[PDB]
From a paper:
To understand the presubstrate binding state, we used cryogenic electron microscopy (cryo-EM) to determine the structure of RNA-free HsDis3L2 to 3.4 Å resolution (construct Dis3L2D391N residues 1–858: carboxy (C)-terminal truncation of residues 859–885; and an engineered catalytic mutation of Asp for Asn at residue 391 in Dis3L2). RNA-free HsDis3L2 has a vase-like conformation in which three oligonucleotide/oligosaccharide-binding (OB) domains—two cold shock domains (CSDs) and an S1 domain—encircle a funnel-like tunnel that reaches into the Ribonuclease B (RNB) domain and leads to the active site. The OB domains provide a large positively charged surface, which probably acts as a landing pad for the negatively charged RNA. The overall structure of RNA-free Dis3L2 is very similar to the structure of the mouse Dis3L2–ssRNA complex (MmDis3L2–U13) (root mean square deviation (RMSD) = 1.2 Å, calculated over all Cα pairs). Thus, the apoenzyme is preorganized to bind single-stranded RNA (ssRNA). The vase conformation is the only one observed in the RNA-free form and with long single-stranded 3′ overhangs. RNA-free Dis3L2 is preorganized in a vase conformation to bind RNA substrates (yellow), with a seven-nucleotide-deep tunnel leading to the nuclease active site.
Numbering used by the authors: 49 to 113, 231 to 254, 265 to 820, 828 to 858
Amino acid sequence: IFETYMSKEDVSEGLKRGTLIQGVLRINPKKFHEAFIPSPDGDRDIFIDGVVARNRALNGDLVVVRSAKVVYILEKKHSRAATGFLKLLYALFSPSDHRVPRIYVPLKDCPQDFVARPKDYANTLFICRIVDWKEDCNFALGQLAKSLGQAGEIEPETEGILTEYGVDFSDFSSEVLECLPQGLPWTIPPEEFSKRRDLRKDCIFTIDPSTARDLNDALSCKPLADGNFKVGVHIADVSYFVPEGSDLDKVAAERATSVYLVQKVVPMLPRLLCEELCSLNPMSDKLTFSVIWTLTPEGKILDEWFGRTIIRSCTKLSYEHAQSMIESPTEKIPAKELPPISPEHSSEEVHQAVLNLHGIAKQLRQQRFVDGALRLDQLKLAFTLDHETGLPQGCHIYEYRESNKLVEEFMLLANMAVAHKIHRAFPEQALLRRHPPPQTRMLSDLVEFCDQMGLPVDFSSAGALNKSLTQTFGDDKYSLARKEVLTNMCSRPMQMALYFCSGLLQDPAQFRHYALNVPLYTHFTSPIRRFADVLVHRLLAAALGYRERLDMAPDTLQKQADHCNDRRMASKRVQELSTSLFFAVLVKESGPLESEAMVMGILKQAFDVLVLRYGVQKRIYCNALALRSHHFQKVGKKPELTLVWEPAQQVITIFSLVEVVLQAESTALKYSAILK
């Protein structure tokens, strides 16, 4: 039995006075009896003990409240749905996630076969929605939605996590497709040859991954007569095809971002706009919102010009061909291994252009990292799948080659220029991004860990952290894995970047983006994938005088920014769970996997390893080992584990190389790591 809520008047009086604290509660996934809310001042996170003192609040909900109890909930931000197995002791519903409680389902809603034949529905996934939670029941009451399929397959589990996080994957209604342009061979109206600059004769190319349906940007470089370069970044304008107030705009605001999975993509726009009308496919006249600079070979801006233009791309490179033409500076690459090119242009022009853009991008990278920019890069693996069955065949870690940096530098230049322009035009309504500095309290724990063990790292500033992480060790077989484990330890106290409106924050200290070490930043180069990009596009168009001033209030922009923030968070969590699902299926269908590992932590009966080939973090317990004995020691707050397997002995401490094997178990989506 819980305790009843407080009325609105008391909550308003308490909040205005300052006796009550609002926050977004975070629940530990591994232990569900404890919860945490952030302090307003910036002190240690306020602890919430018990399950009773959470008082029917779920993870992600914002509440109004040293150990404390939750007494009021303003906004319910959780989706209130879960994927679980159906059992008996009404009927009981058990979710896979342990933060959602256990749910009662009425026996009228259950299928007829289930009451007669319970066993045959013992490995089937069901989706249930919580509708009400009583004051006298420890279990919520729910409604059964549908039958997903067999547990452990690919499509039932994918649709289960998409519905559990709230991503709307349903098809577009016809009132959305009625706002699209009509006519199958759409062409540019002849009235746009006067409001736009004609760039159809220049050399324009795109560099995006080979498996990319939609293209958001194009690049160009032209050498001048005094040793300078004219460098242009051209973005497909989705604000021409998305009018304000139409049902297309309401749907695109409803889903802030598009979600990328292992096997498919859940889009933001209709497929016509995402693939044919707006994406910069080669050999077609397209409308773009370009930025054009004149740069020195050292990467210094001498001119800047914004404006609407018309382009015609000549080729579509990938991240694989671009490295070939970078790594062949003085040798003609044969045309057999190149994508098709428009007949007006030659492969020499494109080949020369990639070299010049790489030459500028190297010096821009060096100058940005002298200025203090920080880069914490973890491991991102990519799969190779079966075309017909749809099961994964094999994984390999993605490789961040030079061509992935050549594009990234120019996207940063375009974003910084657009941020300056739209902030200097409208100071009271502008959408910008911000990265706070990391929290000092839980940076201090990393300070006290790394001050020992003879490791000279410092967390005073971002540039200091980057130079410390790079100079101390490199170019050794153990040192690269050492770099990976230190990066994984360092990436934990960092905060997440936020969208915000410039008319509500008062002081100019908050605006600066910490990790890039710049005072102003925004998102302008990906309209098809995000909706904040479309808002920035409209604001920039209003600033240059192409249209009238936005008729949107500065508080509605804050509400829209909060919605885009929560949607981005849900998108990142969904991609993480999809990658984990496909890796578990690969381990089950490819036998035991052998690799090496480094110990990242030690405990009395367990220790954490990091598998070097795959980058996952499993846990290894001494109960599963075939050992005679084990002893735990600590000296100078340094853990040590001694294993007795005349038998031999092994000593394992932090940053020790072991050999591990991954083996699937009888459960559908589980595996285990065992020492070899």
